[PDB]
Nucleic acid binder design. Structure first.
Lengths: 733, 486, 745
RNA sequence: GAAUGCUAUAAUAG
RNA sequence: UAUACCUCUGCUUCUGCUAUU
RNA sequence: AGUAGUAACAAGAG
């Protein structure tokens, strides 16, 4: 019965006419202004002020209470506290020795439900404690800066939803309007309220602790193949720029996080296997030794029922039943008839902008599902043909309709985009348009339905239509029907295609997604040369390192047998980071320059090193025999993932002065591994295939010629070329 | 409109661009080479390479600063007892009689059997700590009527020339000793291989610095500033003698206490952070101040005896200086330990870089060298106009030493120089990278760098070293002049 | 001998790679001393120096000497110009609007919708604000309170409605009041009985008195800016002046900034408001595309740029134009709302500060001359430097000791909007369809212009044009600081690009110290900084492990809490050593209790209490985590009502224990006449605490209601009592008193 | 095979 | 003046905006 | 004196 006291203390307070008027005039809103009212300035140098203050006699202020009085004035000739009261706490000031006294000879309080209150932190420690550390590995790591979750949540909610859930637990009376969110987390509230029931910790602390494990802490971090929160929390020990440490958290790991990481692995395997002769051979080699956190990939694919084309391809490659089951966030499909042909086109959206989306051609039928609700969907290129659905939850039925309409990529659905939609984030990174459109129309459904159309309902046996309200109605949306009703052997080609017993194909290596994304869990490849499924810059650096390592042998062997040492496992891996549609031509160019050095004697060891890896892909010359010429060699990834022919590039550059080679910001020395005559020996010779230097810039010849203009010269014709800035060179064909 | 305005705008408005050539980069701060200017004087708080600590081998477990200073002087009684002022050097506005009286007061007070280290406010101690030297406040009304009361012309830092002792400090502080000072506390046991790599990597990095001269000097500054702050707040109104003390460990693993001298702390009623508290220092040294006389105009020196430096009987002097710190400098002194981090990280970067290239841990390889790789070397300095290389360990220590000097000579002059020079450093890297750089107003760029060079020993020597290094790069560039030139 | 040179590292390692070694951040940052009047007067002189050729006129509102550079004569030299042409700005804005279609209205919408929801308490979060009632700086939260209390006296109750809009309406309305009245406290002696010889005691009680000011005197105060000097400004020789603005002006700045932020977020070349990793990502992505999209057989160049006299030249009247253009399709009220903040800045007045101190070396006397009495003594008295300043100040000086400052943005709180003006310049791209093409990045005054062209000679012709363009917007590119080179390496906001943004561990080294919050908090911060630096700032595992060591040392010295087994003599150490001997589970003792450090790389993220909880002693943990310990201060029930501060949400994870204490408040206030404010503080604190006792949720979430605080408190207690009676918690005798006492309200 | 966007007392940056 | 060899004080002697959140 | 450096502290107040 604290009520009585409060009421009486109000009467005490209301005697003071200053307080009386404050309470009368100051609104409940304005509490937030007067609470923050203070006299003092903001301490700009607290590090200093603290260091200084700790040398004083009584720096700390107790709270005026009976407990404060359990501390003695002094202990064995040490002034623990003073009689003088603090301005703030209105309680006796004390020394830091007071704290130490309390902790040594103070009263022993009750710590009941402490581990329940601070469970969040104990789990954090438990995950470290019940962990297993693998091996540290030294080698280039391409870290990507992505927005990730810092701490594992018990259940994720928006701030507002979380705030109301927290209110229901701690402060039921001052909750306000009951939101539907209250009912959704009914078990969580009930659970938490029972666990925190036995406690003597301040409610404001309990509030922020629950907030810590409900509100999401999602911030940008440099990551490399580990997005899961339980990994992120240990990000400092996971890797650096030039090293990587294997780490397995404790407790549990989510099946969805297993699923999405499983996909990434399968895609990486396929993306590398494609380039090898007999891809299935290499695919199998890797997949068996591919581990996800601690669970093998083969085991993962068996256990998990889901995944994309890549998962099924590898499943077939291993010898496991392929699942035609797909996912689109909340929607789960399983194809029965049709064939998907994804193709990038410029879609114009309702608001009045153009976005590059992949559209799927052909007539297809799937078994759509959303929780308790089920159905069958028939679609075509940017049009929903027909959609049969079941009858279950009113809200679950409502979602499936929206999901299926979006999944269809209907021209109507794109035209109903009215508002602010973001396909590019604040840091100018891509957001998946189809998954963004899924989130948008899941909220604003009223606009979608109106911009779609309506028609007469079906008049069949068990077929009766539903309208906007999601009840049985005469009007229904164009291609919507509600009903009362709810394994074949495959083989895989060595070239990675799933052929049926008849002969028609279900999937191919060409059908998997090109996108490379950060795995949720840590992918390990338990094979030597695991780097092969790395990033562009990882593969690029390791290759050129392997060239330098064996430069003694590779350069010598080249001067004997021509094409004996062009086929190497490093250069195979290196091909998989080259755009396939330009790989052939690069090899045609590189080999032609390589041989040109050997034959005509005009060598260049850095240029040898630079181009040698490109000489793997079977060459592809022009129609007139002469190879393709190039200024730069563009590779998979960002605009800075390119090699230069004449100049240095962000990936590769040589400093003759220091004889230092710079590969992806790492500095290697070519001192000792360089010829004496090579110093003054110009680069002009090893820059264009079937071209050699004659003299210097001749103004009579005119300006510098492009790739084209040089390619369109008759053997014997001279020309002007610019290698890097301020270095003209006159060259013949 | 833009096009129209651009047309009618005067051509005199332009960036006036020019392509940078090595020849355009003249030496920064030409005045520092002019002999007419005075040799930049030593102006640190404590001595560094000129230091001398009286070694008192202790039980190993700690004791009171008065007690350890007493027992340390008890050991070296011949120095402690010397009561005859044999004056060598005398600072212009100093007082030989007072300073010596003060020294003796310190020695006597520290040696007595009392608990307190308070000094009575004598005629000499009052002069020494600048007693009652603050001007009295008066009303504006009275000040306005007084014609003789004026706003004083701001005192500007005087211009100085290059001094060899700065070079010599860097040279000596870098070098290895047998003595370990650092007080690095315990850590949790290793589990993760990262931690195991880190620990083994520490054994190389930490030791290399810990076993150098610069390391002790730092710890001296830290530990002194630590107690000097504690006295300043606790004993505001008391003149107090504070021993310049430090703990050292030799190869055999024995704890020696090092008494480098005694200091006295004036009244320390510090409201503001910038508010000054006068500290008069008395420091032991084997350095003969007659040698480099232009280095010690701020100091007053007394020959106080002799000691065995090895087989040689070196004479022991006593450097006496009135100094001053404020609430900030003392705090930054206690946070000087972080000099280790700036120096360690930078060199660890190299190890980690090299490690990715080779595929294994290149820590042990870079210092010593292993079966595969021979040890890493760095262009370290010069010897009669010819570049010289040095160890990874040497290169490490130079950076650590450099970082300590950033603290020790840390003011607005250094900030300004370091920032504006970084601008010019990058232009050189462009020329090195052959990324043909352009400039708009080079003189203006220089101005900002050159105006910062006044009376900072570190800035002045950095301006020298920059000019030296520039000349060598300017030579190295030549190699690239004729490349792919037919 | 062998003479070591540290610059010889740059032979073996490129500058960018080891840029860390060029930041001396183990050194002391520059601090100012005494007065900022010298530094302020300079700003005032220069600002008008760059606008002196514009339209000079007298304000018929304040009587001040207003100067207007806009639409002025174009410069004849490279000296800083503020003579920005409106048409050139509007064109640049149009170009921006074309290439970013329907962004202005999109931002104006969101900004407008934001304003509607925005409460007044939004103004209670901005350090020291100028309080016009007392003509000195106060905490933001108090500055608002003082204004609200004063507004009520003049019949202005817009603040009571809760939203920012009606409060803002009151601010612009308050300018129309003929006289403004405000409370200012005076002390009063009063006899009070006591166990004294004479049997009484005199005590000084404060009482609020209503002071008046005229229409003009209030306006000037509303337009006033308090001036200081920027302390701890790194990498700069000579000091610079800054300014804090009034609560009146801060209300309108919020919207204009919010508007500009919305625009910036959706701009390709904006460094704001993105920060850290998000920024690095954006700029890394941006550099890649602008790099690769260069014409083949051409030269891409990067001008590492910097704008000198940024705030001094940029004019409010241009910022007014910017709002009018951006709010094209917004309703008339919102167009007018946004227009106020620029208008106020265009008529702003600068307070000159503390004044100058005059001395006599012979007499050893010093005295501060206030700014009103600055021209009291002859100018022969002042030093040569100051003498000239005062002469040049004269035509802008106000006799009450202020300065008219129509041009410039002295306070500079249009970071976003000034960035937009910059981006708009980068938006031009080309002039007269020449053989170049420019596009850059912009973080306020710092910019990085890329130029793709045929030859470097042509690139220069483009940079020359970009330079000349900026001059038309009132943006002056520093010729002295800015430099140019072939693309691959540049500097932007002290982020150093060399085929990728390099690591620069030195910059944020000063964060490795003891934070100065308290023992429990600083430990977490310490280990969190180390953890975060291992990630972002590329600190290796050796340096990281040492970073722990060096921290623990600092911590053990600062909080004088060395290891219990150590023999380091001290006052706190005496009890620590007893605790060491008493305790069995010494591995469970925290470091601050003289316990051993068990932190390593792997467990930086875990609280020390939670790490050691399981290996603590039951008596020790009970003491350490006592739920009614007096060091932290809990709740409860007699009359516990101290000056409590609202408990914030901090990022560091730490447990509430005895080491989570608070320091005693600086007692300098007890000498000065500001004494009185303590009672005012404790008065509010009395109310707020009882209100918190009534509504426990008020601590967690902001309570809402335009009704009276007393009204709310009454009803809740009435309900509580009624239910407590019927339930059987409260007795009849108590319930009699309950309803009786509540009846008296 | 995507997301989920915010708000500290330190430090750094502008 | 007096109490005063007493008493009180040690960021408050004007420390801004914005981003990393 | 000294700290220091474009202006201060070298105690301030009843």
């Amino acid at each position: 019965g604290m009520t009585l006291a409060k009421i009486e203390l109000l009467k005490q307070l209301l005697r003071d006419n200053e307080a009386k008027t404050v309470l009368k005039q100051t609104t409940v809103d304005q509490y937030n202004i007067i609470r923050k009212f203070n006299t003092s300035r903001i301490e700009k140098n607290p590090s200093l002020r603290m260091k200084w203050a700790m040398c004083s006699n009584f720096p700390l202020a107790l709270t005026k209470g009976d407990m404060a009085n359990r501390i003695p004035l002094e202990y064995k000739g040490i002034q623990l506290k003073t009689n003088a009261e603090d301005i703030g706490t209105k309680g006796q000031m004390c020394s830091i020795a007071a704290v130490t006294w309390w902790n040594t000879y103070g009263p022993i309080g009750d710590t009941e439900g402490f581990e329940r209150v601070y469970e969040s932190f104990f789990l954090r420690k438990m995950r470290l404690d019940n962990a297993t550390w693998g091996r540290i590995t030294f080698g280039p790591v391409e870290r990507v800066r992505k927005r990730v979750l810092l701490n594992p949540l018990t259940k994720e909610m928006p701030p507002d939803e979380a705030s109301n859930v927290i209110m229901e637990i701690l402060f039921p009376k001052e909750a306000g309007i009951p939101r539907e969110s209250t009912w959704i987390h009914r078990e969580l509230i009930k659970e938490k309220r029972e666990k925190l029931k036995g406690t003597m910790i301040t409610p404001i602390v309990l509030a922020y602790m629950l907030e810590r494990e409900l509100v999401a802490r999602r911030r940008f971090l440099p990551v490399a193949g580990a997005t899961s929160a339980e990994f992120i929390e240990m990000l400092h020990c996971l890797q650096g720029e030039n090293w990587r440490q294997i780490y397995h958290p404790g407790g549990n790991k989510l099946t969805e996080s297993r699923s999405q990481s499983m996909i990434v692995a399968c895609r990486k395997i396929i993306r590398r296997s494609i380039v090898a002769s007999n891809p299935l051979e290499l695919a199998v080699e890797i997949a068996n030794k591919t581990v996800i956190d601690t669970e093998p990939l083969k085991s993962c694919l068996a256990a998990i029922d889901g995944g994309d084309v890549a998962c099924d391809i590898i499943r077939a490659a291993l010898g496991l039943k392929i699942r035609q089951r797909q996912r689109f966030g909340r929607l789960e499909l399983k194809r029965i008839s049709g064939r998907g042909f994804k193709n990038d086109e410029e879609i114009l959206i309702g608001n009045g902008t153009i976005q590059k989306i992949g559209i799927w051609d052909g007539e297809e039928e799937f078994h759509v599902r959303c929780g308790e609700c089920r159905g069958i969907l028939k679609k075509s290129k940017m049009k929903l043909e027909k959609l049969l659905i079941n009858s279950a939850k009113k809200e679950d039925m409502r979602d499936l309709i929206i999901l299926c309409m979006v999944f269809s990529q209907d021209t109507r659905m794109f035209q109903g985009v009215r508002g602010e939609i973001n396909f590019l984030n604040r840091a100018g990174q891509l957001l998946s348009p189809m998954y963004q459109l899924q989130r948008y129309f899941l909220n604003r459904s009223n606009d979608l339905f109106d911009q779609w159309g309506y028609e007469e309902s079906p008049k069949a046996s068990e077929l009766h239509g539903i309208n906007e309200s999601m009840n049985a109605s005469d009007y229904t949306l164009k291609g919507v029907v509600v009903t009362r009703n709810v394994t074949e052997k495959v083989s895989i080609t060595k070239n990675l295609s799933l052929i049926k017993r008849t002969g028609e194909v279900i999937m191919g290596a060409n059908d998997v997604s090109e996108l490379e994304s950060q795995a949720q869990l840590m992918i390990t490849y338990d094979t030597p040369k695991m780097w092969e499924m790395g990033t562009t810059k990882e593969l690029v650096q390791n290759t050129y390192q392997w060239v330098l390592k064996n430069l003694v042998t590779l350069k010598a062997q080249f001067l004997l047998g021509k094409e004996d040492m062009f086929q190497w496992d490093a250069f195979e891996a290196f091909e998989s980071i080259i755009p396939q549609k330009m790989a052939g031509q690069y090899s045609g160019f590189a080999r032609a320059v390589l041989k040109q050095m050997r034959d005509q004697e005009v060598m260049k060891t850095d240029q040898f090193i630079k181009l040698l890896p490109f000489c793997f892909s079977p060459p592809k010359l022009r129609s007139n025999g002469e190879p393709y010429q190039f200024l730069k060699l563009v590779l998979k990834g960002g605009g800075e993932n390119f090699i230069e022919v004449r100049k240095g590039s962000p990936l590769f550059s040589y400093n003759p002065q220091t004889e230092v080679l710079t590969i992806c910001g790492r500095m290697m020395s070519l001192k000792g591994k360089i010829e004496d005559e090579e110093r003054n020996r110009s680069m002009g010779n090893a820059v264009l295939a079937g071209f050699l230097v004659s003299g210097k810039y001749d103004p009579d010849l005119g300006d510098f010629k492009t790739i084209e203009e040089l390619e369109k010269l008759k053997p014997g014709e001279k020309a002007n070329i610019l290698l890097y800035q301020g270095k003209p060179v006159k060259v013949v064909k | 409109a833009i096009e129209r305005n651009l047309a009618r705008m005067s051509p005199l408005v332009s960036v006036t661009p020019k392509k940078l050539t090595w020849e355009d980069l003249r030496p920064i701060g030409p005045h520092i080479y002019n002999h007419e200017l005075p040799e930049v004087p030593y102006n640190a708080f404590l001595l560094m390479s000129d230091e001398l600590g009286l070694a008192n081998m202790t039980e190993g477990k700690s004791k009171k600063p008065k007690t350890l200073a007493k027992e340390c002087l008890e050991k070296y009684s011949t120095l402690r007892d010397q009561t005859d002022p044999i004056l060598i050097m005398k600072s212009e506005k100093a007082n030989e009689n007072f300073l010596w009286k003060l020294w003796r007061d310190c020695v006597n007070t520290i040696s007595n059997e009392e608990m307190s280290n308070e000094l009575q406010k004598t005629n000499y101690a009052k002069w020494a700590t600048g007693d009652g030297l603050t001007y009295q406040k008066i009303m504006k009304e009275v000040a306005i009527d007084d014609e003789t009361m004026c706003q004083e012309e701001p005192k500007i830092p005087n211009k100085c020339r290059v001094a060899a002792w700065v070079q010599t400090e860097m040279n000596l502080l870098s070098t290895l000793t047998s003595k370990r000072a650092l007080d690095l506390p315990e850590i949790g046991p290793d589990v993760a291989p990262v931690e195991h790599v880190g620990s083994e990597r520490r054994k190389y990095f930490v030791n290399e610095i810990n076993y150098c001269k610069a390391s002790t000097v730092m710890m001296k500054y830290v530990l002194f500033h630590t107690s000097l702050l504690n006295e300043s707040n606790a004993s505001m109104g008391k003149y107090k003698v504070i021993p310049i003390t430090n703990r050292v460990v030799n190869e055999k693993g024995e704890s020696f206490d090092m008494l480098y001298g005694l200091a006295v702390k004036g009244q320390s009623h510090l409201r503001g952070d910038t508010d000054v508290v006068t500290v008069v220092t008395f420091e032991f040294s084997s350095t003969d101040p007659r040698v480099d006389s232009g280095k010690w105009p701020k100091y007053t020196v007394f020959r106080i005896g002799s000691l065995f430096v090895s087989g040689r009987e070196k004479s022991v002097y006593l450097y006496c200086r009135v100094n001053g710190t404020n609430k900030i400098q003392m705090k930054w002194g206690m946070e000087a330990r972080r000099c280790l981090l700036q120096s360690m990280q930078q060199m660890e970067a190299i190890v980690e870089q090299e490690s990715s290239i080779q595929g294994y841990d290149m820590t042990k390889a870079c210092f010593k060298g292993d079966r595969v790789n021979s040890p890493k070397t760095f262009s370290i300095g010069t010897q009669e106009g010819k570049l010289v290389k040095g160890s990874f360990g040497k290169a490490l220590r130079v950076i650590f030493t450099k970082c300590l000097m950033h603290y020790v000579f840390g003011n607005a002059q250094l900030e300004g120089f370091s920032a504006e020079s970084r601008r010019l450093l990058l232009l050189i890297q462009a020329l090195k990278d052959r990324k043909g750089p352009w400039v708009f107003d080079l003189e203006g760029m220089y101005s900002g760098i050159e105006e910062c060079i006044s009376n900072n020993p570190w800035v002045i020597q950095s301006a020298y070293w920059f000019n030296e290094w520039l000349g060598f790069e300017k030579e190295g560039s030549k190699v690239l002049e004729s490349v792919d030139e037919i | 001998g062998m003479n070591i040179n540290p610059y010889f590292l740059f032979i073996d390692v490129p500058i960018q790679a080891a840029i860390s070694t060029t930041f001396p951040y183990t050194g002391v940052p520059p601090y100012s001393h005494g007065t900022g009047t010298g530094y302020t007067i300079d700003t005032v002189i220069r600002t008008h120096e760059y606008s002196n050729k514009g339209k000079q006129y007298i304000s018929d509102v304040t009587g001040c000497t207003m100067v207007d550079p806009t639409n002025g004569p174009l410069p004849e030299d490279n000296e800083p110009s503020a003579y920005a042409q409106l048409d050139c700005v509007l064109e640049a804005l149009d170009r921006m609007d074309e290439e970013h279609p329907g962004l202005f209205q999109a931002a104006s919408q969101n900004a407008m919708e934001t304003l509607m929801v925005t409460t007044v308490d939004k103004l209670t979060q901005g350090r020291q604000t100028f309080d016009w009632t007392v003509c000195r700086n106060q905490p933001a939260a108090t500055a608002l309170n003082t204004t609200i209390t004063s507004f009520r006296l003049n019949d202005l109750n817009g603040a009571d409605k809760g939203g920012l809009i009606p409060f803002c309406q009151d601010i612009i309305d308050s300018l129309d009041r003929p006289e403004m009245t405000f409370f200012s406290v005076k002390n009063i002696k009063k006899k009070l009985p006591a166990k004294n010889r004479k049997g009484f005691l005199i005590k000084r009680i404060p009482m609020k008195v209503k002071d008046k000011i005229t229409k003009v005197e209030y306006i000037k105060r509303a337009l006033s800016l308090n001036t200081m000097t920027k302390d701890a400004e790194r990498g700069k020789l000579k000091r610079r002046a800054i300014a804090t603005a009034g609560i009146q002006i801060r209300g309108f700045v919020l919207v204009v900034e919010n508007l500009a932020k919305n625009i910036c977020e959706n701009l390709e070349q904006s460094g704001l408001p993105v920060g850290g990793n998000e920024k690095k990502a954006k700029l890394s992505n941006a550099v890649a595309k602008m790099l690769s999209n260069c014409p083949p057989g051409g030269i891409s160049m990067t001008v590492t740029g910097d704008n000198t006299k940024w705030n001094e030249c940029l004019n409010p009247r241009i910022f007014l134009a910017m709002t009018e253009r951006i709010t094209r399709d917004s309703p008339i009220w919102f167009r007018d709302f946004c227009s106020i903040a620029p208008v106020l800045f265009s008529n702003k007045i600068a307070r000159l500060g503390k004044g100058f101190m005059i001395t006599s070396k012979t007499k050893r006397l010093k005295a501060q001359i206030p700014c009103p009495d600055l021209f009291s003594i002859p100018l022969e008295r002042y030093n040569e430097e100051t003498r000239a300043k005062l002469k040049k100040l004269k035509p802008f000086f106000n006799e009450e000791g202020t300065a008219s400052l129509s041009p410039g943005m002295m306070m500079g709180m249009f970071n976003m909007l000034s960035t937009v003006l910059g981006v708009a310049a980068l938006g031009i791209k080309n002039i007269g369809n020449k053989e170049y093409l420019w596009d850059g990045l912009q973080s306020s005054d710092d910019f990085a212009l890329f130029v793709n062209a045929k030859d470097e000679e042509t690139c220069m012709e483009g940079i020359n044009d970009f330079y000349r363009t900026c001059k038309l917007l009132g943006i002056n590119m520093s010729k002295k600081k800015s430099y140019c080179n072939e693309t691959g390496m540049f500097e932007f906001t002290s982020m150093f690009y060399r085929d990728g943004f390099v690591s620069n561990f030195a910059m944020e080294l000063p964060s490795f110290g003891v934070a100065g919050v308290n023992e429990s908090a600083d430990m977490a911060i310490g280990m969190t900084i180390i953890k975060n630096n291992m990630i972002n700032n590329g600190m290796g595992p050796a340096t990281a492990q040492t970073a722990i060591q060096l921290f623990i040392a600092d911590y053990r010295y600062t909080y004088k809490c060395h290891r219990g087994d150590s023999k380091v003599e001290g006052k706190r150490m005496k009890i620590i050593k007893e605790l060491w001997e008493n305790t069995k589970g010494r591995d469970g003792l925290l470091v601050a209790d003289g316990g051993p450090n068990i932190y390593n790389l792997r467990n930086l993220h875990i609280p020390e209490i939670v790490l050691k909880y399981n290996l603590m002693d039951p008596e020790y943990k009970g003491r350490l985590l006592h739920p009614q310990n007096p060091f932290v201060g809990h709740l409860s029930e007699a009359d516990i009502t101290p000056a409590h501060g609202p408990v914030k949400k901090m990022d560091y994870d730490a447990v509430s224990g005895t080491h989570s204490w608070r320091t005693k408040r600086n007692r300098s206030i007890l000498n000065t006449d500001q004494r009185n404010m303590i009672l005012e503080e404790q008065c509010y604190a009395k109310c707020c605490n009882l209100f918190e006792a009534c509504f426990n949720s008020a601590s967690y979430r902001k309570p809402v209601g335009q009704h009276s605080m007393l009204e709310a408190m009454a009803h809740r207690l009435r309900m509580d009592a009624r239910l407590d009676y019927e339930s059987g918690r409260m007795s009849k005798d108590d319930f009699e008193k309950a309803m009786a006492h509540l009846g008296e309200i």
